[PDB]
Amino acid sequence: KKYFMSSVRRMPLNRAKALCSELQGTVATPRNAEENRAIQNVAKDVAFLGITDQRTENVFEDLTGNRVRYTNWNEGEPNNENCVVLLTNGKWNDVPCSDSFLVVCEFSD
Amino acid sequence: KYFMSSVRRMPLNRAKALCSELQGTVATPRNAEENRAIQNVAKDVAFLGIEDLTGCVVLLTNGKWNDVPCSDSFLVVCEFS
Amino acid sequence: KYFMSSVRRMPLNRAKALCSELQGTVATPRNAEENRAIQNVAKDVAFLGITDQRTVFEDLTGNRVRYTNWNEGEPNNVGSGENCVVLLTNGKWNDVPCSDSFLVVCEFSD
Amino acid sequence: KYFMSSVRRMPLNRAKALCSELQGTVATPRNAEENRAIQNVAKDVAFLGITDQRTENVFEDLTGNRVRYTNWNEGEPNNVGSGENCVVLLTNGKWNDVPCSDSFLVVCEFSD
């Protein structure tokens, strides 16, 4: 239903959003524990998720404006433009959108 | 191997960079079946990865290949294994 | 992704509102498997979330559809901008008036 | 049984129609586990399928059967000269009675 592919280099979210979009995809956004795990397995290191507080300050939503219905915050998170990264243990950290991380793109038919 | 086409047109350089950044390469037809599958994904003229990018050419809607400059812009179809 | 069918037949406008009220949308098949899944859930002719209202058949998200399964002779235009799509019991698609009434299959996801 | 919530608030009458349209019914918790599950789908205050229209302070599900399991906030309701009373699930998981005419989120339950 969803194809996940990781980038080779680390980059800020703006470059990441543009990368996934180029091939009609989006920055990976897990809707449940299974997808979270799926993305965690393809990413070789900490990677960006398609969740930010860009539209509404300090309120996390997906790239379509919906508040996320699934989260998996690391202990102490989200700790406050805010972005989200998926750690190697699968938990989430709140980080600056300007910092660079691997990118996992999500694709569907 | 699955194929995905870009939303916009671009020169082969940017195209090779795009597919490789996501760990694939510009679609390279190995047989009539793949050439056909690649055209099916590209819904208009698109670059091919042609030696292939790892040891220019565009695929037309009729499935035939034309030799065009590596500097002009067309759609890109990336292939992933 | 899961699908649920309505009990009543209704026009596209009502269909859309119905599905969205429970955080879903009108079922929109992205491949043959999904088309089959929707086919199984609706045991009768039902609306799909595809129309030409914004033009060109697009999903209720403004994107042109990348999957279709037109019945022989379809799509037969009913009138620019008022074209909708229904899935027949055999799984093929017909182009019909958005104002006509059909069952509705809503799609939901996590 | 699986649950789904609405995006907007509405009176009980409209909620009943909404859930039935998709072959379900307004969610009715039959035990604490379901109650917790419905509250989890329903982040905010939501209607349950229980009212005392017939006899004041006696709550029945939408089929006319008096409910067994209850999780009243501050004990059983004890209204007087009241309109039809409905039940909403609060953020604390307890139940509170409110006029069926007021508007709250809806949680539908399905058995598909």
Curated annotation (Swiss-Prot), chain A:
A Gene Ontology cellular-component term: collagen trimer
Domain C-type lectin: 1-106
Name this polypeptide is given: Mannose-binding protein C
Domain notes for this protein: The coiled-coil domain mediates trimerization.
Keyword terms, alphabetized: Calcium, Coiled coil, Collagen, Complement activation lectin pathway, Complement pathway, Disulfide bond, Hydroxylation, Immunity, Innate immunity, Lectin, Mannose-binding, Repeat, Secreted, Signal
A GO molecular function held by the record: protease binding
Function, as annotated: Calcium-dependent lectin involved in innate immune defense. Binds mannose, fucose and N-acetylglucosamine on different microorganisms and activates the lectin complement pathway. Binds to late apoptotic cells, as well as to apoptotic blebs and to necrotic cells, but not to early apoptotic cells, facilitating their uptake by macrophages.
Bridged cysteine pairs (disulfide): C20-C105, C83-C97
Subcellular location: Secreted
Species assigned in the record: Rattus norvegicus (Rat)
Lineage: Eukaryota, Metazoa, Chordata, Craniata, Vertebrata
Organism superkingdom: Eukaryota
BP GO terms, sorted: antiviral innate immune response; cell surface pattern recognition receptor signaling pathway; complement activation, classical pathway; complement activation, lectin pathway; defense response to Gram-positive bacterium; innate immune response; killing by host of symbiont cells; negative regulation of viral process
Subunit structure: Oligomeric complex of 3 or more homotrimers. Interacts with MASP1 and MASP2. Interacts with MEP1A and MEP1B and may inhibit their catalytic activity.
Gene: Mbl2
